[PDB]
């Protein structure tokens, strides 16, 4: 009886616990990176472009005047 219970617990762990937690870790990593890092870098790039063309407009105005 004890060996059956222990074997059932071990098999259940191997087949369900890790097999569910590993996809959870993979999904967490994928979401975290591909959303937070990607969108933060995109926001920073958009801000850099905004500053760049603001400087370009300033230069154009200086050339005009």
């Amino acid at each position: 009886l004890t060996l059956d219970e222990a074997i059932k617990t071990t098999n259940r762990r191997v087949n369900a616990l890790e097999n569910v937690v590993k996809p959870r870790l993979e999904n967490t990593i994928t979401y975290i990176k591909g959303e937070l890092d990607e969108l933060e870098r995109e926001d920073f790039f958009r801000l850099k472009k905004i500053q760049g063309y603001k400087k370009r407009e300033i230069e154009r105005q200086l050339a005009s005047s």
Binding site: K33, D37, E38, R41, E42, F45
Partner: protein, 589 residues
């Protein structure tokens, strides 16, 4: 002409280059620092200086080079040591005297003051020539007679041919005139790292690479011009296989491209390769370095040089192939190249695609791997060369999910799949036969059939035996070896014998240091015949294990049988052992 205007770290913006081309190298400042042109905004350009940019003063002159990143090929390329940006390290150390690499060294890649015995071909002085013609041959060294050829993309009527004499690289030996103008050609020539060497026609790969190890030669053959990937990062097993390839492989010459690896590993390689020597069929001893061009790039070196080192090496290999010699190119760490790529991408601020890698990683990697194959040369006489890449994959964390690993696996044909577990299992070859795969097996049809008609069937049976073994391992772990059927028990025992003797080659012992194709094929034939004639016999398992133990000992003696005992002698011994096993198995049953 041209003065720096904005020097912001790696990038330097200089005015005056109205005519600068995209991706053209340019020299910056008094120190003659080297940089590439990226952005040609207006009359100004953009220079990413590879070396350190400190100390630069505004209006420092910038000198154009009229050439993209190019490697100076020709005679004398072999033997020497070169950096990622094609800088001869040994001559730099000799001339400079000091140990460090000076910021602004300008030593030419090949010393043009050295004299090479130039021997011209019988081509007529008033003849007509085109690109790729083997117009002469120069004895750059022993064992690697350099078959110099007329530069590609050049066709003309020859005007003058130099006689057989000692000449320098700067000395001119050729001149041609297709149009009214006549242009002289020297022995040294240049080619961009990016653009591949022109090839008349890619050819289907037909003949295999003989690594000298039984496992790779037999189980998972690799063709000439076939891409190979090694998952090696620790234990220097990849360096061991590289040394084996340098010593024994079919490659007429070998190029090792070490980029982005630790300095200590590079030093170990630079001392280990000269120690190694390659035995000729004549048997007299000749050093491998005379046939080997080594390119090393440490982490201290500039990142851009590390990225371009791969193309430098592959272009050298392409020159050797166009010279009509089979050549093997080994990349120490493709993952280090990927790290260099991510660093450059971050420097130039590209949009990341997957885990920080730039989007174009797949395209660059695919192009580099695809620059290797069996090739019909350009020009005449018609000869065929081959570049085969054994570039090594070094995944961080040992996960195939790494984008570089996935891309390589998508591109690579043969993946030998070295495993650290086998090294922990006291296996010297450490080649995981299971997780490794061969995709060139069908390509070896003609070669295997010519060498041995039953070799294909033997290989298929061996693969089936390996699969049955991996199943029977967990089957035995389930209940035990006894519960298995007699034929299943024989199969398990024969698979264990195969793994212990055939698959696992020590390569430390002189007898097993080099395993020829004939010896390996005969050992496989003996093993398969013993297994077969034992399986039909069943009689009992234990009973035949005892009565056929002499047959097992004779089969193991095939591993004892070595080319060191002589190839015909080894073949005769293997045939005798197979006959003895056949007689013992048949007569007993």
């Amino acid at each position: 002409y041209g003065y720096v205007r904005k020097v912001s770290g790696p990038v330097v913006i200089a005015d005056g280059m109205n005519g600068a081309a995209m991706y053209e190298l340019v020299r910056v400042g008094h120190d003659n620092l080297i940089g590439e042109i990226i952005r040609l905004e207006g009359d100004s350009a953009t220079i990413q200086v590879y070396e350190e940019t400190a100390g630069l003063m505004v209006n420092d002159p910038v000198l154009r080079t009229h050439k993209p990143l190019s490697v100076e090929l020709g005679p004398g390329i072999l033997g020497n040591i070169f950096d990622g940006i094609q800088r001869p390290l040994k001559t730099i150390a000799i001339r400079s005297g000091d140990v460090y690499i000076p910021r602004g060294v300008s030593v030419p890649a090949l010393d043009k003051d050295t004299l090479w015995e130039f021997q011209p071909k019988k081509i007529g002085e008033g003849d007509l020539l085109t690109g790729g013609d083997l117009y002469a041959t120069v004895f750059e060294n022993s064992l690697m007679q350099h078959h110099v050829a007329l530069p590609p993309d050049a066709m003309g009527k020859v005007t003058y041919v130099a006689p057989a004499g000692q000449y320098s690289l700067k000395d001119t030996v050729l001149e041609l005139e297709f149009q009214g103008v006549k242009k002289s050609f020297t022995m040294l020539q240049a080619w961009p790292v990016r653009t591949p060497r022109p090839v008349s026609s890619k050819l289907a790969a037909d003949t295999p690479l003989l690594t000298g190890q039984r496992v790779l030669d037999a189980l998972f053959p690799s063709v000439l011009g076939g891409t190979c990937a090694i998952p090696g990062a620790f234990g220097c097993g990849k360096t061991v296989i590289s040394q084996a390839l340098s010593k024994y492989s079919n490659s007429d010459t070998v190029v090792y491209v070490g980029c982005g690896e630790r300095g200590n590993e590079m030093a170990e390689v630079l001392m280990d390769f000269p120690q190694l020597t390659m035995t000729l069929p004549d048997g007299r001893e000749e050093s491998v370095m005379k046939r080997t061009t080594l390119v090393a790039n440490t982490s201290n070196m500039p990142v851009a040089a590390r990225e371009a080192s791969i193309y430098t090496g592959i272009t050298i290999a392409e020159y050797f192939r166009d010279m009509g010699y089979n050549v093997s190119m080994m990349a120490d760490s493709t993952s280090r190249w990927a790290e260099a790529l991510r660093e450059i991408s971050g420097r130039l601020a590209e949009m990341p695609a997957d885990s920080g890698y730039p989007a174009y990683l797949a395209a660059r990697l695919a192009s580099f791997y695809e620059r290797a194959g069996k090739v019909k040369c350009l020009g005449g006489p018609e000869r065929t060369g081959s570049v085969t890449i054994v570039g090594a994959v070094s995944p961080p964390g040992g996960d195939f999910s790494d984008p570089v690993t996935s891309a390589t696996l998508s591109i690579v044909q043969v993946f030998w799949g070295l495993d650290k577990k086998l090294a922990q299992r006291k296996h010297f070859p450490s080649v995981n036969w299971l997780i490794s795969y061969s995709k060139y097996s069908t390509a070896l049809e003609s070669f295997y059939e010519q060498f041995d008609p039953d070799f294909i069937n033997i290989r298929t049976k061996a693969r089936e035996v390996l699969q049955r073994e991996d199943d029977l391992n967990e089957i035995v772990q389930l209940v035990g070896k006894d519960a298995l059927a007699e034929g299943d028990k024989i199969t398990l025992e024969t698979a264990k014998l195969l793994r212990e003797d055939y698959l696992a080659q020590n390569a430390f012992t002189p007898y097993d240091k080099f395993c020829p194709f004939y010896k390996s094929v005969w050992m496989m034939r003996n093993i398969i015949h013993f297994y077969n004639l034992a399986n039909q016999a069943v009689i009992t398992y234990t009973l035949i294990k005892h009565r056929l133990g002499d047959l097992f000992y004779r089969l193991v003696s095939q591993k004892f049988e070595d080319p060191a005992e002589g190839e015909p002698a080894l073949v005769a011994k293997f045939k005798k052992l197979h006959e003895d096993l056949t007689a013992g198995f048949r007569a007993l049953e």
